[PDB]
From a paper:
Not surprisingly, substrate binding involves elements from both monomers. In fact, 46% of the buried ADPR surface in each active site is from the opposite monomer. Adenosine recognition involves hydrogen bonding by the E38’ (prime denotes a residue of the other monomer) main chain amide nitrogen and carbonyl oxygen to the adenosyl N1 and N6 respectively. R37’ and Y19 flank the nucleoside base though stacking interactions on opposite sides. As in Ec-NDPSase, Ec-ADPRase, and Mt-ADPRase, R64 of Bd-NDPSase forms a bidentate hydrogen bond through the guanidinium side chain with the β-phosphate oxygens O1β and O2β. In addition to nucleoside and phosphate recognition, Bd-NDPSase forms a network of hydrogen bonding interactions involving the three hydroxyl groups of the distal ribose. G115’ tethers both ends of an ADPR horseshoe conformation by hydrogen bonding to the hydroxyl at ribose C2 through its main chain amide nitrogen as well as to adenosine through the amide oxygen. The carboxylate of E119 makes a hydrogen bond with the hydroxyl at C3 and positions a water molecule to make a hydrogen bond to the hydroxyl on C2. The most distinguishing amino acid residues are K165 and D163, which form a bridge between the hydroxyl at C1 and the hydroxyl at the Cβ of T166. Interestingly, this network of interactions is also present in Ec-NDPSase, but not in Ec-ADPRase, suggesting that these residues may indeed be responsible for differentiation between GDPM and ADPR.
Author numbering:
A (entry chain A): 1 to 182
B (entry chain B): 3 to 181
Amino acid sequence: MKHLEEKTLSTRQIFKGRYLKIEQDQVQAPDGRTYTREYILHPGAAMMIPLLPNGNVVMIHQYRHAVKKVFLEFPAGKRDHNEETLLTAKRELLEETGYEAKDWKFLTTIHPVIGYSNEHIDLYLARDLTHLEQRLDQGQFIEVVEVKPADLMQLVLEGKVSDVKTQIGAFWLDKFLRGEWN
Amino acid sequence: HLEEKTLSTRQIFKGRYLKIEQDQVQAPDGRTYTREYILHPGAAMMIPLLPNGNVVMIHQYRHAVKKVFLEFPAGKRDHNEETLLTAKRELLEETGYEAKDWKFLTTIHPVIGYSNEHIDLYLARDLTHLEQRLDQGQFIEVVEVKPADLMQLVLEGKVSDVKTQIGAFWLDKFLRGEW
Ligand SMILES: Nc1ncnc2c1ncn2[C@@H]1O[C@H](COP(=O)(O)OP(=O)(O)OC[C@H]2O[C@@H](O)[C@H](O)[C@@H]2O)[C@@H](O)[C@H]1O
Ligand SMILES: Nc1ncnc2c1ncn2[C@@H]1O[C@H](COP(=O)(O)OP(=O)(O)OC[C@H]2O[C@@H](O)[C@H](O)[C@@H]2O)[C@@H](O)[C@H]1O
């Protein structure tokens, strides 16, 4: 697929807001011509599917101003300082929900916005959980809930799990639970 | 309860393609925070199912991530048109197909932390193969993929595009009679 590649002729950071950083590149496309590409520079993230002994999964409810709504999500956060994402996932599970896990399994890496961000999210399965306490960050508001996976899958079908990272977790979990993928 | 209340709004950036909104909001702690996110018109993605049971997919380079992706065809809403019109036009332009049977599946939000983007996913059936009509700076190859192969590619980490991976899973439930 080499003949679809675009070659970067220049890059600059075009904007830095309070949170978002934008890179503007000029690229040479397969027609030999020059096009502008803009995208967000993102450190990456981790998300985890925390499977409780009773077979429910620990999830959160969190308001997302970008969309003006509350979402049901699996816990997640940004990579800090180029850390291994396993450390991200561990830290975020403890902070957002109060849990630790003895068994961590990497499932897959996803890209949520290939059109305009370099973000990748590493998705983990966390098992053999024990509870401590929630440690929420400044400006983070999050209610923790337990969800039966069968109810989750029905929520997906019904359009109530629109958060792509979480919906994808749900489908991988479904695969794991029916024993098709391990 | 969890809702944040908008106190002020500003469009802080508009480049060649991206537009960023910056809001001051009041959160449940009563405190003021900044929220910044891309303003995106919305998009449609199309799962085009062929009489032979394969699906039409595309390879496209994505500079944000610096590699070529396997994707279902997709594009952005033009002028707040109905996303089914977006879907019909992009399927024609990206792949050269038209479909006489369209079904909305679901709406996904690919980046709830920093974009208002939504993508509406559709199933397209009863197809006729015309020719592509690509936009400028748009370079795309069309491939047929067997859904069983597509699911193995998902397992292997080779369909990392969230919208397409989600399409694959919905196709799987449909094809298995589950949904
Ligand atoms: N980040 C970008 N920077 C510069 N130009 C872009 C970018 N993304 C797209 N373009 C250009 O703008 C046009 C609009 O593209 P569409 O087909 O409407 O949308 P596409 O880029 O396919 O994305 C639609 C959807 O797919 C998703 O994975 C993507 O994140 C978006 O949600 C194209 O001709 C393309 O060359
Ligand atoms: N658009 C935004 N504007 C301002 N502040 C933000 C924004 N998004 C997040 N924050 C805040 O900055 C901190 C960064 O949190 P993250 O570790 O990014 O947690 P989250 O926002 O969940 O991001 C993890 C991931 O989840 C995805 O769905 C999301 O799009 C991102 O990839 C949090 O305290 C959060 O409240």
